[PDB]
């Protein structure tokens, strides 16, 4: 036992360089975030369809993706965000699987479909990242009024692109905003009507005239030649002299004559400004999930230093998200803060007996120690956030102690032979006789540890990296106890202290039921912070760069939007400390950015706290700002960046609850989701439905006649010619210019499309070479729909999310189901379905009253162990509660809130104090050899048991006090503040603590008088 | 699937089944696929009838070519009216048997 | 891939630099004149049909025999298309029931280009393969950036990068001084056991 | 290395153009795929090779299937025919016998 | 057996068997049978006459 891994002594110190080098290595390597990447496991599918309607955008391309997916294993939902002029379809199965495996799996049924979708619109398949995946985000500026804004934007694309994707690990490198040179024939009516050329001539002439074809090797001049045909269709002369009339010995109506083509701006999608000054195109950098944000960005930036020169001139580019930072500014927090934990260790063992060797052996063997907790990453997998990251500060904790133990015990042993090498064979045997109660009693708290931490659902994706990383730091630290053995060999207080205990000594003596009692006291007071909790529950954390974001009523246009941005984007740049501000609003140009237009993101750079406000707690700028910001119709959110992206895909419900209703028809759950939407009210449940907040947004129906089309002779699809190309300006033909192509559009004026009455004079020119106006083939009706979609398998689906907070309401779900089923009617078709973060919270409810009393199964079948009787064992376990309660109390003082942060202090807590009450647990029972030595057995008792304890009792109080000032020391620096985020580390220091000031204070107590008892 | 009384029909069943029961399933954890037999499919059919069709002139790549053609719906933009942007629309979807015709 | 092959000679590197030895090789330009298509009433694509189909013999659908299927050829015979002055008089048929000839829709130049094209990343890139035999060179490639960015020209839009079997020869040499002195921090860890005393190891 | 060949039969055409109408759309769209190493392209006349490698000793049958993501969506950005092929399945080395 | 003769139709051999194995052979491609002559070679009539 602890024979053998002193016989492998002097093994050890080799071990344990093998473990200095190595440890040195792979430290200085790891992946290094924050915010775990999770949003769960996904699969982005886009589809570009340059424009369209979501009723449409809907039926003839989503159609196609949300449908055939039901196909394809990993089964899980094909859920729809199907909107106007884009399908986004996100397939995601269950938390943590391979997903180069779950993305060929999707691909499957992907390919089989692209005849059951149109003509190009090709389907995107996400891209490798998550959406914790923007790393890095720049934007393009100019200097000079001597550059394009399409210059840019096509330098973005066409030299910026090639020049990063080009780089190890990342993935994707999306342009946002500015404008892309659009080679534009408008057709012109009147030109278009005398010569007698329609648009099926047109377009069909435009499709023909712009390829480029060979044919053959000549054999001339033995060197054999290859023949070629001109045709890329670039300059804008060759545009037009395109033909159309082809009046033969005369003249051949050319592409001039009918239409005046000019290069303009592609119909914009994603518009970026920063600052009032820049309306500008800049891109981002996407993380191809999965590696060390730190080195990517290092790579960029280098790349981009390099680049700084083969731009042109007047071109700046500007950093509006370095993603690097808040990396520092955390990663140097945890690399102060340990060497911190030292400063405060080395005073108080220097402070206790006097004259410390522990720290200094300590301190070089935990970067080593470190040293293995990320290998075992290694093993299996996990990232370095801070999550992780907390389990390496509770890792000092539960380091300091063992390290204690071997310190203090060998003070015994080292004094007693200094009253009367082998001085070395001595100071072994005494770590014998209390010996395990060190390294069992580390193994003890992290197995405890881990039963809270398996957990699952969104939170428990959220807890798996800590969770691990405990597991790591103990490993550490566990067969380190058993290890910080071999190690270690290469006055006044305590008086007033002792005094102050023999009275107590005499007096949990004096009093049996006392402590009973005075705990009935304790361990109820405990319930009034325990049913109060303050308020709230897990939130929170620091961005280095806040994010703007809306509530937005649906329909908007788009130079309103585009000003509506240079203002808000103007206003923003009010307070000081902002450094830079970015208002990209419409998509980003990637499939992650699902963004509609009225959908405005802005990243906001905020200078280091170093200077420019007295006060302003994150809070003060949040709420001064929120109010530097109040226009109309715009509910504003104020969010970080990774929360910001990372719950903008997470599909589904931040809500906890919602009733989806599926089946065949937008009747049926429109009807629907009004038919239900009272039941809310009246019974228990406080109640907000919204059947439709979605469906906001207008259109310009154009019934076509049927009847009315035959009669002119022009077949109602020729009909629609003239509302998609001729109108909205839908494009035909992309020029090209090598490397980079841009596109040719084709439609009339700027003006005969320019509003609803206008277009119901729309001039129409059939095939029977007649003239007429489309209002003369179709009604034009205006009308009111949905700027949105939502999909559930294939099916329409409505969910509805709903929410009674700060409860626990699985009650009220089981009464809505009897209650809808004794008089509510379902159309033809029809089923309704539940679903929330309700399902998580109840799943893991059920599963952590099976993992809690399976750590205590494994906790009892070794808290009677290594000393025998149960009396003992139900000791140390009414004993802890108390720790809690002192604990839990120090949060009520700060009003806080709980969470699986305080969650987890909880629980290093009730396992060193469990490690300190066993402990006096042993002073008081391996020795039935004090209790004879002492001993006048026979009418038992006496001043003789008060004797027993008083010399277990002083002992106590030199190991225990200096463990518990330097747990009581750690648990602190983090408290009062963290420039680099610690609402973490904070919030799990939080009861841990109470805990101590109760707990040690609760060691000196049980021990005696549960003891009297049992 | 079964009838209990003779108001619902083949095709209405069929459908049924594929309509509305295969979207009901699939969503079941480890159930892939889930594939209707028998029945009839609703049938939409245009028979020729080649006296009417010799009177009038058109030849069969003149029905399909219009059949292809006359059965879709199409847009084309946002049109920029009183200030809350408007997206247009194309009807086409051939439902009633009144387009048909 | 011309401006600074020159730059190996001055410089203390042995020298052979080779812009483009690829482009060798040599074409029929067939430049059909627009505007010289409109009156005649033919869409250049058309234009096309007749430098494609009619002259190097592109093929258009395949003849079935069963498990094996051959293809079907289509074009002018053996000889209209036997030599650029031949092919300035092709005979053209327009949709205007009126005949013409190629040369008479376009200019049939010659010219000389490229039989090969590499290309590093979409964007077109020229690998400018080098040498100085039997030393170690890592010396000279640093001169030379440097040398670079003090007087040379970069037109709009563009980058250069450096690779070769150099960086490979010099990770390795990297690594290999981490894993001979790791090879014996492990053998010293070792070399002193079964006997204990240094003098002896 | 590790490889995956990329074939394109394209009867006949040119260099410029063989490279224009029907590499353009393989270098390119191949830049967007995990294992994003090199898209490194030998694009000639009647014929555009390209070639995707990564790093060394990587399991190929994911090497594989990963590439082939970005090559099925683009089939309508080349011509017509002239369908891609991908890889065989061998080395270079892969060529054992070899008769007449 | 009863059930064998309760459907004595023509032109049907009538093979009953349990569900697993029906469907579990039912794809199982090849041959049932302990052998067989392939015969390959790029047309009907060579391995229609052969
Ligand atoms: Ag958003």
Same mark, same amino acid.
């Given at each position: 036992?602890?024979?053998?891994? &002193?016989?492998?002594?002097?093994?050890?110190?080799?071990?344990?360089?093998?473990?200095?080098?190595?440890?040195?290595?792979?430290?200085?390597?790891?992946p290094?975030?924050?915010?775990p990447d999770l949003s769960d496991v996904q699969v982005i599918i886009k589809?570009?369809?340059?424009?369209?309607?979501?009723?449409?955008?809907?039926?003839? !391309?989503?159609?196609?993706?949300?449908?055939?997916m039901?196909?394809v294993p990993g089964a899980k939902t094909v859920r729809?965000?199907?909107?106007?002029?884009?399908?986004?379809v996100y397939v995601i199965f269950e938390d943590g699987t391979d997903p180069y495996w779950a993305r060929s799996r999707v691909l499957e049924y992907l390919?089989?479909?692209?005849?059951?979708?149109?003509?190009?619109?090709?389907?995107e398949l996400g891209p490798d990242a998550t959406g914790v995946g923007?790393?890095?985000?720049?934007?393009?500026?100019?200097?000079?009024?001597?550059?394009?804004?399409?210059?840019?934007?096509?330098?973005?694309?066409?030299?910026?692109?090639?020049?990063?994707?080009?780089?190890?690990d990342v993935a994707e490198?999306?342009?946002?905003?500015?404008?892309?040179?659009?080679?534009?024939?408008?057709?012109?009516?009147?030109?278009?009507?005398?010569?007698?050329?329609?648009?099926?001539?047109?377009?069909?002439?435009?499709?023909?005239?712009?390829?480029?074809?060979?044919?053959?090797?000549?054999?001339?001049?033995?060197?054999?030649?290859?023949?070629?045909?001109?045709?890329? *269709?670039?300059?804008?002369?060759?545009?037009?002299?395109?033909?159309?009339?082809?009046?033969?010995?005369?003249?051949?109506?050319?592409?001039?004559?009918?239409?005046?083509?000019?290069?303009?701006?592609?119909?914009?999608?994603?518009?970026?400004?920063?600052?009032?000054?820049?309306?500008?195109?800049?891109?981002?950098?996407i993380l191809r999930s999965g590696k060390?944000?730190?080195?990517?960005?290092?790579?960029?930036?280098?790349?981009?230093?390099?680049?700084?020169?083969?731009?042109?001139?007047?071109?700046?580019?500007?950093?509006?998200?370095?993603?690097?930072?808040?990396?520092?500014?955390?990663?140097?927090?945890?690399?102060?803060?340990?060497?911190?934990?030292?400063?405060? !260790?080395?005073?108080?063992?220097?402070?206790?007996?006097?004259?410390?060797?522990?720290?200094?052996?300590?301190?070089?063997?935990?970067?080593?120690? #470190?040293?293995?907790?990320?290998?075992?990453?290694?093993?299996q997998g996990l990232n370095?956030?801070?999550?992780?990251?907390?389990?390496?500060?509770?890792?000092?904790?539960?380091?300091?102690?063992?390290?204690?133990?071997?310190?203090?015990?060998?003070?015994?042993?080292?004094?007693?032979?200094?009253?009367?090498?082998?001085?070395?064979?001595?100071?072994?045997?005494?770590?014998?006789?209390?010996?395990?109660?060190?390294?069992?009693?580390?193994?003890?708290?992290?197995?405890?540890?881990?039963?809270?931490?398996?957990?699952e659902?969104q939170?428990?994706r959220?807890?798996g990296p800590?969770?691990?990383?405990?597991?790591?730091?103990?490993?550490?630290?566990?067969?380190?106890?058993?290890?910080?053995?071999?190690? *270690?060999?290469?006055?006044?207080?305590?008086?007033?202290?002792?005094?102050?205990?023999?009275?107590?000594?005499?007096?949990?003596?004096?009093?049996?039921?006392?402590?009973?009692?005075?705990?009935?006291?304790?361990?109820?007071?405990? *319930?009034?912070?325990?049913?109060?909790?303050?308020?709230?529950?897990?939130?929170?954390?620091?961005?280095?760069?806040?994010?703007?974001?809306?509530?937005?009523?649906?329909?908007?246009?788009?130079?309103?939007?585009?000003?509506? #941005?240079?203002?808000?984007?103007?206003?923003?740049?009010?307070?000081?400390?902002?450094?830079?501000?970015?208002?990209?609003?419409?998509?980003?140009?990637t499939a992650t950015?699902?963004?509609?237009?009225?959908?405005?993101?802005?990243?906001?750079?905020?200078?280091?706290?170093?200077?420019? @406000?007295?006060?302003?707690?994150?809070?003060?700028?949040?709420?001064?700002?929120?109010?530097?910001?109040?226009?109309?119709?715009?509910?504003?959110?104020?969010?970080?960046?990774?929360?910001?992206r990372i719950?903008?895909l997470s599909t589904?419900?931040?809500?906890?609850?919602?009733?989806?209703?599926?089946?065949?028809?937008?009747?049926?759950?429109?009807?629907?989701?009004?038919?239900?939407?009272?039941?809310?009210?009246? &019974?228990?449940?406080?109640?907000?439905?919204?059947?439709? @907040?979605?469906?906001?947004? @207008?259109?310009?129906?154009?019934?076509?006649?049927?009847?009315?089309?035959?009669?002119?002779?022009?077949?109602?699809?020729?009909?629609?010619?003239?509302?998609?190309?001729?109108?909205?300006?839908?494009?035909?033909?992309?020029?090209?210019?090598?490397?980079?192509?841009?596109?040719?559009?084709?439609?009339?004026?700027?003006?005969?499309?320019?509003?609803?009455?206008?277009?119901?004079?729309?001039?129409?020119?059939?095939?029977?070479?007649?003239?007429?106006?489309?209002?003369?083939?179709?009604?034009?009706?205006?009308?009111?729909?949905?700027?949105?979609?939502?999909?559930?398998?294939?099916?329409?689906?409505?969910?509805?999310?709903?929410?009674?907070?700060?409860?626990?309401?699985?009650? !009220?779900?089981?009464?809505?189901?009897?209650?809808?089923?004794?008089?509510?009617?379902?159309?033809?078709?029809?089923?309704?379905?539940?679903?929330?973060?309700?399902?998580?919270?109840?799943?893991?409810?059920?599963?952590?009253?099976?993992?809690?009393?399976?750590?205590?199964?494994?906790?009892?079948?070794?808290?009677?162990?290594?000393?025998?009787?149960?009396?003992?064992?139900?000791?140390?376990?009414?004993?802890?509660?108390?720790?809690?309660?002192?604990?839990?109390?120090?949060?009520?003082?700060?009003?806080?809130? *709980?969470?699986?942060?305080?969650?987890?202090?909880?629980?290093?807590?009730?396992?060193?104090?469990?490690?300190?009450?066993?402990?006096?647990?042993?002073?008081?029972?391996?020795?039935?050899?004090?209790?004879?030595?002492?001993?006048?057995?026979?009418?038992?008792?006496?001043?003789?048991?008060?004797?027993?304890?008083?010399?277990?009792?002083?002992?106590?109080?030199?190991?225990?006090?200096?463990?518990?000032?330097?747990?009581?020391?750690?648990?602190?620096?983090?408290?009062?503040?963290?420039?680099?985020?610690?609402?973490?580390?904070?919030?799990?220091?939080?009861?841990?603590?109470?805990?101590?000031?109760?707990?040690?204070?609760?060691?000196?107590?049980?021990?005696?008088?549960?003891?009297?008892?049992?």
């Amino acid at each position: 036992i602890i024979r053998r891994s &002193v016989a492998n002594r002097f093994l050890v110190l080799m071990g344990a360089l093998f473990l200095s080098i190595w440890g040195t290595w792979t430290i200085i390597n790891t992946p290094v975030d924050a915010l775990p990447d999770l949003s769960d496991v996904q699969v982005i599918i886009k589809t570009s369809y340059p424009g369209q309607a979501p009723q449409i955008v809907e039926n003839q !391309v989503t159609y196609p993706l949300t449908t055939t997916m039901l196909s394809v294993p990993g089964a899980k939902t094909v859920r729809g965000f199907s909107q106007f002029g884009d399908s986004y379809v996100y397939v995601i199965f269950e938390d943590g699987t391979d997903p180069y495996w779950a993305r060929s799996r999707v691909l499957e049924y992907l390919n089989q479909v692209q005849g059951k979708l149109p003509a190009g619109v090709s389907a995107e398949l996400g891209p490798d990242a998550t959406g914790v995946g923007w790393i890095y985000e720049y934007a393009l500026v100019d200097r000079s009024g001597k550059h394009d804004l399409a210059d840019l934007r096509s330098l973005q694309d066409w030299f910026l692109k090639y020049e990063l994707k080009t780089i190890p690990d990342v993935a994707e490198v999306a342009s946002v905003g500015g404008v892309v040179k659009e080679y534009q024939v408008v057709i012109d009516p009147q030109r278009l009507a005398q010569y007698g050329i329609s648009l099926a001539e047109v377009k069909s002439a435009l499709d023909a005239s712009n390829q480029e074809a060979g044919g053959s090797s000549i054999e001339l001049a033995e060197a054999e030649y290859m023949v070629r045909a001109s045709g890329y *269709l670039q300059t804008l002369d060759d545009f037009n002299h395109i033909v159309l009339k082809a009046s033969e010995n005369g003249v051949p109506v050319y592409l001039r004559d009918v239409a005046k083509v000019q290069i303009g701006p592609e119909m914009r999608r994603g518009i970026a400004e920063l600052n009032g000054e820049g309306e500008v195109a800049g891109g981002v950098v996407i993380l191809r999930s999965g590696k060390n944000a730190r080195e990517v960005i290092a790579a960029v930036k280098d790349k981009l230093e390099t680049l700084k020169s083969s731009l042109p001139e007047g071109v700046e580019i500007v950093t509006t998200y370095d993603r690097s930072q808040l990396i520092d500014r955390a990663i140097d927090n945890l690399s102060g803060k340990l060497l911190e934990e030292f400063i405060v !260790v080395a005073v108080v063992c220097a402070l206790f007996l006097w004259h410390v060797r522990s720290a200094l052996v300590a301190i070089i063997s935990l970067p080593l120690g #470190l040293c293995i907790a990320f290998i075992v990453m290694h093993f299996q997998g996990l990232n370095a956030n801070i999550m992780s990251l907390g389990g390496i500060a509770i890792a000092v904790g539960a380091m300091v102690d063992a390290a204690i133990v071997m310190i203090e015990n060998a003070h015994k042993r080292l004094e007693e032979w200094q009253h009367q090498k082998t001085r070395w064979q001595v100071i072994t045997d005494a770590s014998v006789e209390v010996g395990p109660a060190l390294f069992i009693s580390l193994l003890i708290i992290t197995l405890s540890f881990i039963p809270i931490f398996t957990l699952e659902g969104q939170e428990g994706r959220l807890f798996g990296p800590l969770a691990f990383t405990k597991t790591y730091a103990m490993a550490g630290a566990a067969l380190l106890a058993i290890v910080v053995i071999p190690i *270690l060999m290469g006055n006044p207080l305590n008086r007033f202290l002792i005094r102050v205990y023999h009275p107590l000594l005499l007096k949990v003596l004096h009093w049996p039921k006392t402590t009973l009692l005075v705990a009935a006291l304790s361990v109820l007071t405990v *319930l009034w912070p325990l049913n109060k909790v303050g308020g709230e529950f897990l939130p929170q954390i620091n961005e280095g760069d806040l994010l703007y974001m809306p509530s937005t009523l649906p329909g908007i246009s788009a130079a309103e939007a585009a000003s509506m #941005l240079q203002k808000t984007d103007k206003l923003i740049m009010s307070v000081p400390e902002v450094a830079r501000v970015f208002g990209k609003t419409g998509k980003a140009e990637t499939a992650t950015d699902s963004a509609p237009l009225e959908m405005v993101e802005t990243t906001i750079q905020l200078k280091p706290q170093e200077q420019w @406000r007295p006060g302003m707690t994150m809070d003060k700028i949040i709420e001064e700002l929120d109010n530097t910001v109040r226009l109309p119709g715009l509910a504003n959110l104020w969010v970080p960046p990774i929360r910001n992206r990372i719950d903008m895909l997470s599909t589904g419900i931040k809500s906890p609850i919602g009733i989806k209703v599926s089946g065949t028809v937008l009747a049926d759950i429109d009807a629907m989701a009004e038919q239900i939407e009272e039941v809310a009210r009246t &019974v228990p449940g406080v109640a907000s439905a919204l059947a439709e @907040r979605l469906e906001g947004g @207008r259109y310009i129906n154009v019934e076509i006649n049927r009847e009315k089309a035959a009669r002119y002779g022009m077949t109602v699809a020729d009909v629609q010619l003239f509302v998609t190309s001729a109108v909205g300006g839908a494009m035909v033909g992309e020029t090209v210019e090598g490397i980079a192509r841009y596109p040719i559009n084709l439609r009339y004026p700027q003006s005969w499309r320019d509003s609803p009455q206008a277009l119901r004079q729309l001039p129409i020119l059939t095939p029977m070479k007649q003239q007429i106006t489309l209002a003369d083939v179709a009604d034009i009706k205006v009308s009111t729909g949905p700027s949105m979609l939502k999909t559930e398998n294939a099916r329409p689906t409505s969910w509805i999310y709903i929410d009674a907070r700060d409860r626990d309401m699985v009650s !009220v779900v089981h009464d809505l189901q009897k209650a809808i089923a004794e008089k509510v009617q379902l159309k033809p078709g029809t089923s309704v379905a539940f679903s929330g973060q309700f399902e998580l919270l109840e799943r893991a409810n059920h599963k952590l009253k099976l993992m809690v009393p399976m750590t205590l199964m494994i906790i009892f079948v070794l808290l009677y162990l290594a000393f025998r009787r149960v009396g003992e064992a139900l000791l140390i376990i009414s004993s802890v509660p108390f720790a809690l309660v002192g604990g839990i109390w120090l949060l009520w003082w700060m009003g806080f809130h *709980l969470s699986v942060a305080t969650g987890t202090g909880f629980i290093a807590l009730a396992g060193v104090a469990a490690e300190f009450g066993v402990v006096m647990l042993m002073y008081l029972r391996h020795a039935i050899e004090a209790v004879p030595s002492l001993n006048n057995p026979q009418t038992f008792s006496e001043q003789k048991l008060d004797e027993a304890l008083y010399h277990g009792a002083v002992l106590r109080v030199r190991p225990k006090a200096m463990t518990v000032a330097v747990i009581i020391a750690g648990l602190l620096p983090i408290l009062w503040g963290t420039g680099a985020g610690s609402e973490v580390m904070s919030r799990i220091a939080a009861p841990m603590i109470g805990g101590m000031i109760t707990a040690p204070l609760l060691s000196l107590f049980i021990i005696p008088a549960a003891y009297k008892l049992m």
